[PDB]
């Protein structure tokens, strides 16, 4: 496979084609906006 | 300013009021579940 | 105001962050206003 970059391309794009991940994640707006908090209460001046 | 402030300071019992007002609903205040009277710190300041 | 409003409210009402400023604010008072010549000096020079 790897004495061809066509072979080897041909290879890895099939590779990858077969992954399917999916994951389970919090609502965007809720975390931002907890985070959100913890700084604003404890920061002295406007946080980065 | 003297005199503003001199006569602020001689009126400051008048606070007295807000004392009577909390003090008056003692049973209501106290014979409940909601009421706690220790600082837990590591409450999540989020939830405040 | 704000010394007064002091008696009202028990510390756990005030972000731990503010109660500090608060001492600050005063502390800078004390220094600007009651402090002598000499004793500002001496604190400025023990960086104090």
Same mark, same amino acid.
């Given at each position: 496979?790897?004495?061809?970059?066509?072979?080897?391309?041909?290879?890895?794009?099939?590779?990858?084609?077969?992954?399917?991940?999916?994951?389970?994640?919090?609502?965007?707006?809720?975390?931002?906006?907890?985070?959100?908090?913890?700084?604003?209460?404890?920061?002295?001046?406007?946080?980065? | 300013?003297?005199?503003?402030?001199?006569?602020?300071?001689?009126?400051?019992?008048?606070?007295?009021?807000?004392?009577?007002?909390?003090?008056?609903?003692?049973?209501?205040?106290?014979?409940?579940?909601?009421?706690?009277?220790?600082?837990?710190?590591?409450?999540?300041?989020?939830?405040? | 105001?704000?010394?007064?409003?002091?008696? !009202? %409210?028990?510390?756990? &009402?005030?972000? #731990?962050?503010?109660?500090?400023?608060?001492? +600050?604010?005063?502390?800078?008072? !004390? %220094?600007?206003?009651? &402090?002598?010549? #000499?004793?500002?000096?001496?604190?400025?020079? +023990?960086?104090?």
């Amino acid at each position: 496979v790897y004495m061809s970059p066509l072979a080897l391309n041909n290879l890895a794009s099939r590779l990858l084609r077969k992954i399917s991940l999916h994951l389970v994640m919090q609502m965007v707006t809720a975390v931002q906006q907890d985070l959100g908090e913890v700084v604003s209460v404890s920061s002295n001046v406007t946080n980065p | 300013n003297t005199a503003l402030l001199s006569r602020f300071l001689d009126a400051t019992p008048n606070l007295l009021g807000i004392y009577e007002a909390i003090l008056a609903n003692t049973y209501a205040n106290a014979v409940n579940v909601y009421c706690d009277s220790v600082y837990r710190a590591d409450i999540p300041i989020e939830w405040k | 105001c704000l010394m007064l409003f002091q008696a !009202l %409210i028990p510390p756990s &009402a005030l972000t #731990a962050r503010q109660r500090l400023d608060i001492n +600050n604010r005063f502390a800078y008072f !004390l %220094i600007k206003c009651h &402090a002598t010549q #000499a004793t500002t000096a001496r604190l400025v020079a +023990n960086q104090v």
